């Protein structure tokens, strides 16, 4: 996409590939940063680059920014318990902030893989139905079985027409 300063961050791929997934305790994340100062720098790049990634993977978490309130950059996390995590980001890099947040309330790669494992056992291989939900529709299409007569017309005997015309006479 042409317009913008760093167009690659408007791409579905870029948004996908960010990895942070909050624990379910996290409701609100609040960023407070400054528009000036060298120290503030990292926080700014965080809002510019990762906040989009983060949000995309945690669509239910309110993220909110505030500019030039406090003399120093920070994050605040509001949890469901009422607990409040306060993360001072000062001379920290963009990357360091993402890593430190992933450490505090993330989800271990174990957790994420278990979850996706529970989602992949949802569509069972041996079922039958619409292409959307299943690998096969009729059993007309499994190798050894009897084929869909819309392909290979049946032997006259298996036809109900023939059976009926037999019982009649």
């Amino acid at each position: 996409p042409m317009k913008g300063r760093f167009p690659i961050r408007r791409t579905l791929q870029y948004l996908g590939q960010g990895d942070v997934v909050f624990k379910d305790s996290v409701k609100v994340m609040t960023v407070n940063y400054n528009t000036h100062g060298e120290l503030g720098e990292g926080a700014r790049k965080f809002v510019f680059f990762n906040i989009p990634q983060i949000q995309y993977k945690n669509p239910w978490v309110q993220i909110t920014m505030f500019k030039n309130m406090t003399p120093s950059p920070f994050l605040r996390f509001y949890l469901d318990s009422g607990e409040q995590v306060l993360v001072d980001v000062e001379s920290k890099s963009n990357k360091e902030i993402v890593e430190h947040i992933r450490k505090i309330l993330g989800k271990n790669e174990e957790t994420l893989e278990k979850e996706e494992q529970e989602k992949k056992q949802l569509s069972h291989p041996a079922h039958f139905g619409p292409r959307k939900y299943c690998l096969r529709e009729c059993m007309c299409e499994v190798e050894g079985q009897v084929p869909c007569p819309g392909l290979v017309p049946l032997p006259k005997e298996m036809t109900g027409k023939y059976k009926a015309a037999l019982k009649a006479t």
């Binding site: 408007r10 609100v28 909110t64 505030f66 120093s72 920070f74 469901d80 306060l86 001072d88």
Partner: protein
């Protein structure tokens, strides 16, 4: 242990729009929503009424809302939990010191 609210909004944080009604703050909450065509994030805003017991709220204060277990009215589903930033009087959560904008009002390195 059952106390719940059917709302998705269990905790929110927002600005105080107006105080005009008795004991009730109007609060603008803002979220990031991803415009599908441009894949970009913009701020959608929504208002919430919140119950203010002591009428503590000036206009402009950043504030935190908790969802009320039993709705006080049709429009009031939240109670005001904390005042996160009083308007124009802000105590830095990091260093615990009074500040006006980006300036320290009382320096944190001068304890005595």
């Amino acid at each position: 242990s059952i106390a719940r609210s059917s709302v998705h909004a269990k905790w929110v944080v927002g600005k105080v729009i107006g105080t005009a009604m008795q004991k009730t703050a109007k609060v603008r909450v803002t979220r990031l929503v991803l415009d599908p065509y441009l894949l970009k994030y913009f701020n959608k805003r929504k208002t919430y009424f919140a119950h203010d017991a002591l009428q503590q709220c000036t206009v402009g204060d950043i504030v935190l809302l908790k969802a009320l277990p039993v709705p006080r009215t049709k429009h009031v589903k939240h109670e005001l939990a904390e005042i996160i930033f009083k308007v124009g009087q802000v105590i830095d959560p990091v260093t615990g010191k009074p500040c006006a904008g980006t300036t320290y009002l009382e320096s944190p390195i001068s304890p005595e």
